[PDB]
Design a binder for this molecule. Structure first.
Ligand SMILES: CC1=C(/C=C/C(C)=C/C=C/C(C)=C/C(=O)O)C(C)(C)CCC1
Length: 238
């Protein structure tokens, strides 16, 4: 139904907004920690970072629980999808919080770190790639609903291994693909390549997140304690 599609767009949009404040709504604040230059790892920063990442994962789970039919999958599947797409979405999220002018990224509490600090916080040799991926997201000029829809598409993917009902997941993803094309084309009929362009960006995102996963490895060797529990759950995945 057209009305059905219109409401799916609103629901997803709202769940995204409610679980992820736009840069504009944030009371930005900074820190002086290792703003100087790049070091292997700033623990005070990784600490603030892992806390913000953990709270983010919880917000992603809340977002997933609010997508139509997610909650209808078996618990096994809900966890499988969450584990498999969580890093992707965490990456899409901070990359949409990037300010080209200041070359910064803002987290959900307003904490705004420059490139050096993102590096020092744990991104290590992967920070410039993340920043370059973020920069390449800019031309897409996506709004909160498109970002919300793109996220719902990354998460509800029936091609993950270990899925008990891939078929149900594929049926759930379908309307999301439709809502995004309709919405994207309605908003910008002047540029019909936006929809396939956003879709192709899913592939890029899966490439940076796999590199993010590799970074968690070396990072594990570098921190003085185990990584936060929810972060560990996320990184245990096929
Ligand atoms: C967990 C983790 C990583 C990525 C974190 C990301 C992508 C966090 C996003 C946070 C947001 C988006 C916070 C907020 O909005 O407050 C990297 C790649 C360093 C590897 C080590 C463990």
């Amino acid at each position: 139904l057209s009305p059905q599609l219109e409401e799916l767009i609103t629901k997803v949009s709202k769940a995204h907004q409610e679980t992820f404040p736009s840069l504009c709504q944030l009371g930005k604040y900074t820190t002086n920690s290792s703003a100087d230059h790049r070091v292997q790892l700033d623990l005070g920063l990784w600490d603030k970072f892992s806390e913000l990442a953990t709270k983010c994962i919880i917000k992603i789970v809340e977002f997933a629980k609010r997508l139509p039919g997610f909650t209808g999958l078996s618990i096994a599947d809900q966890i499988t999808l969450l584990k498999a797409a969580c890093l992707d979405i965490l990456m899409l999220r901070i990359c949409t919080r990037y300010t080209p002018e200041q070359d910064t990224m803002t987290f959900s509490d307003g904490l705004t770190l420059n490139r050096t600090q993102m590096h020092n916080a744990g991104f290590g040799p992967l920070t410039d790639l993340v920043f370059a991926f973020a920069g390449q997201l800019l031309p897409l000029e996506m709004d909160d609903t498109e970002t919300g829809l793109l996220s719902a598409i990354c998460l509800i993917c029936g091609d993950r291994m270990d899925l008990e009902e891939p078929e149900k997941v594929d049926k759930l993803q379908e309307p999301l693909l439709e809502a995004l094309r309709l919405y994207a084309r309605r908003r910008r009929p002047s540029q019909p390549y936006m929809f396939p362009r956003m879709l192709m960006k899913i592939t890029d995102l899966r490439g940076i997140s796999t590199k993010g996963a590799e970074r968690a490895i070396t990072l594990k060797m570098e921190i003085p304690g185990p990584m936060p529990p929810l972060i560990r759950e996320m990184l245990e995945n096929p």
